[PDB]
RNA sequence: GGCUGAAGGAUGCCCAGAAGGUACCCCAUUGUAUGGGAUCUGAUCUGGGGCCUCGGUGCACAUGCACAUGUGUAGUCGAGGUUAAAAAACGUCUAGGCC
């Protein structure tokens, strides 16, 4: 829930600056998430806020809006600190702030380890960015040598404190707070609500305002799931061809549990006029990101994946998921569909189920408590 | 009878497979389709138009696909001594989709009474969700139709005059949906429309919405898209 | 009862005219809206358009003797004229024509 009882409809009423609105709309934000709905106004006014929500789902975006609103544009200095559990997520959050501040004229930086110290000294001397992200240990190692200004900083921010507690830098943040001022705004957010973070609340942040965002993954009834009674493995590809011949497919996600079938079906489809992008279990993470973004853009209309890889990264702008082979991990089924974010407003699931896997269909239907209707012959109008 | 349905199946398969990169390899398949009856032609055009306005991202490819069938004559079933070119039929669908706005609010009005008739809170909320969902389905259509028309323009199946009387028609209806469509159309046709033969007329279009930009009477998001369009114009449409 | 195809229609192009549009301009009300005008158009209809004259090449013929000249022209390339218009020899239907 939220002890603060102002739940807002959209960004329009949030009384943002026009240039910040231009940045956020150029990014693409239309309707706030729960933390965006509620936890934005408290940090605009200047209150000190504790928050708990899912990471990467716009949770950082809320305080991005708030901080960039509070930042004074005229003064070229560092007015706020941000402390991330790692360095690469700090780079991502700096980039996403740039996505919401390209029209601001402000500046953000990402102080990260494994870098030349005097290079950072000169970069801070030439121009102090209005905000800085980083990790508590190297952030303190950077600040203590007076390479920044711990004076003008008026909003201290912790993100993923549970992860910082895992690193065991409680004394490190203790000293970082001891260095900064007294009456500055403080916001801390965490993935969960453990006892250590709650202890951190009463030590540094005064009069907490609590944001308790409820993570959810069950939207079973929103999305429809049909099955096709194809019994021969060789006829599975013909079944897929029929599906593409009788459906209005925008983009499709092909799930395959194993590895050999992935390349087998990839080559079979590439013989036909399809354009596909395929991911394997022996792949790296970088080229996986390349393939994921390539499919996201739309230059390819088929994404062949394996369940764990789709769990690692997902895109919900797809209107059709073919469960080509039902997963041995029954629970992973909900991950395979991906219903965790109401993605199935109009989304459909297709299970090309071999004969002996009708039993598998049965226990997923019962245990998950769903209803897998049979593929109608006249579904072209229903979808 | 089965021939028409089989042709529809193959056409929909081609449309689903159609992508900008793999374009050429499928085009042979398109030219090898036996479209020789007004019903088959009308159905194929219906499929193409529905796909192209319901999925703007790939519309480019579909637009170019239409160019491959700009000359496909067929005899009308009523009077078999007459012929209908594919272009005449595809454009009529586009124009009919373009001017539904005059009637569009009407159907919403025909449902607006139901908003009053849904007495209880549950019924009222469900009716409101359905009417806004319908409003989304329509706004998504109009935008797709506008982008498709703009894409057909770049392939010269249209001419500058139709764009110049479509932009002005969108702009005269100062409602939000029309201004969004205007932003989309100019964004997709600016480079191929910003010529010296149209320099005076164009010089008013943007100026007009500049007043809109300065009025701030509409929703912010509309102003924001109009600012994007104007800035893209300032940078020679790139 | 099956094969094929007329620049005879239809389609495309060009020209004329009409419905419709017309940001800007002008005129009226006068309210920034409607109506009219002026261009600019015309996703749509109604008509019209398959001209001449000269060369090159090729072809056939007829003469003289493989070669040359004359004649006609291949949906020929050009070069010019003429009418407001000089067209996709046409992802089409027929009248036929044949078995
Ligand atoms: Mg008129
Ligand atoms: Mg005519
Ligand atoms: Mg005639």
XYZ file of C-alpha atoms in Angstrom, chain A residues 27 49 80 83 140 307 346 354:
8
model
C 11.057 8.517 -23.952
C 10.706 8.629 1.259
C 21.973 15.000 -5.606
C 23.765 5.002 -5.147
C 32.848 7.014 -1.045
C 12.425 -20.543 -21.442
C -5.407 -9.113 -26.466
C 1.719 -33.877 -29.043
